[PDB]
Amino acid sequence: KIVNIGAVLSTRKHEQMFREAVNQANKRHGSWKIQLNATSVTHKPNAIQMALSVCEDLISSQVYAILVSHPPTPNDHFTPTPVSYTAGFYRIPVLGLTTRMSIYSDKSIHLSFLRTVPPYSHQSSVWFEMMRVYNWNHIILLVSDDHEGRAAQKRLETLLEERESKAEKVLQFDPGTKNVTALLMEARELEARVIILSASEDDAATVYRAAAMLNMTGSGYVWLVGEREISGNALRYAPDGIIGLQLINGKNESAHISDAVGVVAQAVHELLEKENITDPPRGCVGNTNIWKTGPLFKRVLMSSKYADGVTGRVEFNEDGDRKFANYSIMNLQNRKLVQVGIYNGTHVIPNDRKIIWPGGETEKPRGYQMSTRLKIVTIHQEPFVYVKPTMSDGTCKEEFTVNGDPVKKVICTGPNDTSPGSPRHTVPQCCYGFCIDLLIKLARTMNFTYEVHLVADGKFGTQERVNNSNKKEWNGMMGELLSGQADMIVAPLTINNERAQYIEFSKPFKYQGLTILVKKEERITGINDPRLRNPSDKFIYATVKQSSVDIYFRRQVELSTMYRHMEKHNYESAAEAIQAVRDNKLHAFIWDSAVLEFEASQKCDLVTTGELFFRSGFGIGMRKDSPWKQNVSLSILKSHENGFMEDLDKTWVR
């Protein structure tokens, strides 16, 4: 009926208080035959002998629980981890109270680990209320490559997903390493203002100094970290106005010991009144079996609602960690760490002062900064996009229409010819045409600047389980947009449901269809000729890879055989396919109605055949949920009202 408790402390003095603490238990609860006892040790730098002693002193004795703390030297998970292993071999509970590592939160590896301090990752939940309090929507995540960072990232991802929201992007970095200013630069040309960070002290200091080099400390921009990132050198390089979270206890090892002893005594009394407690294995050597009541003791520890703790209610979460924990909100003002609020649950409470924002202002900044210079991406398409080389001076030719007005041309950068055949020189070139005209019109309507640059690969793109991968991933301008290289598409793009899940299509700006082109005698029967339905080697036909027609022929499984024909001769751009048909290398080409009728009205010698088997629209697409969709929609509506697009067509299609 004798009980004993094991301690692994670092002060060698609280140990004596630990001796009192068990006495405190014997002074807080009855003694009887319970025989509440104490046992304590101090861990060593070499964990081998430490674990050996743990076996030969604690498991060998009638010890039913083990507590551990942090050493004065900063090593953290370095010390307690073998203990977490040792307990696992015998399922005895282990209590680590001075650790913020999420690795310890694992149950698969650390079977019987508990903590009254939530890890750094739980801090994510804290900042979850921040944006809710101040109505911040545009949130940027930057996280180290460490597993603790990954866990924090996924935790905050789950949290933001709970409100059916998302961070507009997340970025990863390595600890204490070389060039990091690329990430901060792309953060500059990002949209948001409020930033959140998670790293080590040296890592945070490096981020601070780099951001200071890049003027990120200015107004509007906001940073948000825990208490690790605001200490020492990181504290020195942290600019004023940074908001941080502080533990209410932090380093009061005495309070942790008192609360742990209280909850341990409560759980032990509950187990004793629930009887059948068996006994500790009595030594690592010899005894090789697990302890059967270990799961039972662990579950009663999970349900151990010892609310009489010094820190208040000691309430374990689902994982056995402190739930509804206490923290404080601190603001770094003029090198002074000033507190502004408190946190213990679903609602932060302001207590004093005002938030002195990092830019030195007093007003709460908005979460974003809309950039009046947008991004234009496209593909060279003669009916819609004309691309020519600029002169030696680097300007566009003074070429005027038949009416005498000059064509409005811009300088679109990008590779000089297709990348495999090209030396990959992103040579800026003159570009003009229908889509260019309409984008200029709508830009004048909305009064925003822009940057024009065609797509890198030259293909439209689709989700594809690419080589050595598993997830179907976009390529082309859809991929370039989802990555953020371009913010909106201007091209004769086809609307399809597959794109609809990922790219916001506005209302169509033009209507068109899909048809077949041949030269100059067996007038092809549209999409109803058997000679298409049973492919022949005498008749060769194809489309463009990673294109809308590819998606269409992929959806209709009844057409799959022609799709099987597609993968034989699919072309990469319109020019080579058109020339090959003109050279009779191909027999017939499936493509847009407008493109084919345009070339026929200009090039002649070739005719389209069959009706528009698939009618659709060319609509101006753009990024999901960005505000400009309604503006451009009503703009194209009113352009259709006055027929300005019809005037554009008459300017481009005679």
Binding site: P45, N46, A47, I48, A51, L52, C55, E56, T81, P82, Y85, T86, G88, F89, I103, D106, K107, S108, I109, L111, H147, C284, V285, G286, N287, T288, K292, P295, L296, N470, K471, V557, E558, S560
Partner: protein
Amino acid sequence: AVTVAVVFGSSGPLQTQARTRLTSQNFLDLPLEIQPLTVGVNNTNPSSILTQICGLLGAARVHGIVFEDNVDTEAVAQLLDFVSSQTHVPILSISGGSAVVLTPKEPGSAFLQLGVSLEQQLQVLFKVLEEYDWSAFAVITSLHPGHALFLEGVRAVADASYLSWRLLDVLTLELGPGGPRARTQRLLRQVDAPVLVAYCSREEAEVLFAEAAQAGLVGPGHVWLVPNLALGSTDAPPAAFPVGLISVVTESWRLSLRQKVRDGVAILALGAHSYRRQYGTLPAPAGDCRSHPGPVSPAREAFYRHLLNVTWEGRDFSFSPGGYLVRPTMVVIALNRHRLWEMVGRWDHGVLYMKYPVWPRYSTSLQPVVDSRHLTVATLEERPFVIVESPDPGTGGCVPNTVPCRRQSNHTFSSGDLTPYTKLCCKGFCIDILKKLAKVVKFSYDLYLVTNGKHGKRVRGVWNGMIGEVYYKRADMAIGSLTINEERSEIIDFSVPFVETGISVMVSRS
């Protein structure tokens, strides 16, 4: 000469130690004849295990260590992870226990578990489920740790799965010492699903199978699919384990312990000798019994840069960055009705080869049960209607709108003993009409191409072809370019014809 350590940790008889030690020096077939020093712990406890480890660390210049364990221990893997993290020592695991894969690993570790990731096992088992296209499945787990990761994995796979794979129910139960049967055993009684996927421990599986038999959810029409953690001791399956259980393991499951040890030594020695080739130097020795020196060794980094992509004797023993194996060959094992574990399929290079075209659902009293709805289908190749081709080699299996089909076994000499069955893609008019028949009348079917000749003719007074396979009860129903004639009609029954034809005389227009 490289010194390695062969650690024995599965207790057992002490005859194993010497009978492996004398063969340790008998590895002359491998380059750079190894000097292996072996040790076996008869207690299998952290203190003694660490004592032996640290003693051999201080004993001499050892470079690689291999360890074997009993099939029901888990903490030793974490202990060796601690060893390889603190001391920065490359190690390998074999046999039951340590071979279990731990997805999270300490960055300083080099323990490199020798096993298969759980999600990869899920991929294989869902491919097998696709073989028998059972879109309906129920997820049953216990509160055992890692079941959160297991449900995350099944969610990820179903999310990356192609078809609308019906998750009938995701549920968690209590297992272990006793436990509350109220609203849990009745929960079992209210669960309604023909296919179940499970995840629990070995004894948890033992208890759960006993409950399920007591639950009445056992027998034909009820199929189970469990991971490696649930199974254990393939040699000794308990009476609680129901017949017809399915999982997938490594090909080495059937190999002897000596063979496993020799293969591990071979992999270690091949990595070492690849280092010896590329850099002309023997592998850097390992650490010491006392504390560690510090940062990772660049030579140990070279071993970890040439180790991950090693092969030996036909088998590519490649490893994953997560300290486990990547895309190796696996054997889909199945418990038979004789309470024995045998080979039912093989998953290799993303390809499934099964010896059972249909799943045999034996009943309780050791007898097969034949479904009424499922039905054997036979046909003859014919270009306009019966299109046969090789399965899609790029992705394995068959493209949509096509049915997997097989030859008429090899019954001329191999009456069904050729476990690798040549799959074929069968599509055509007849395939479409039989698909519509199946989707209307709601019956399963079994397609195989007939080989013994042509449509069918009474030869020497006996018939052949589809006529033979059906009249002589070798098949159920036949489809194809079958004309109805009296001589075909006396012995077999025909339905009403669906497409009319006749005799015709073809000629050249010119």
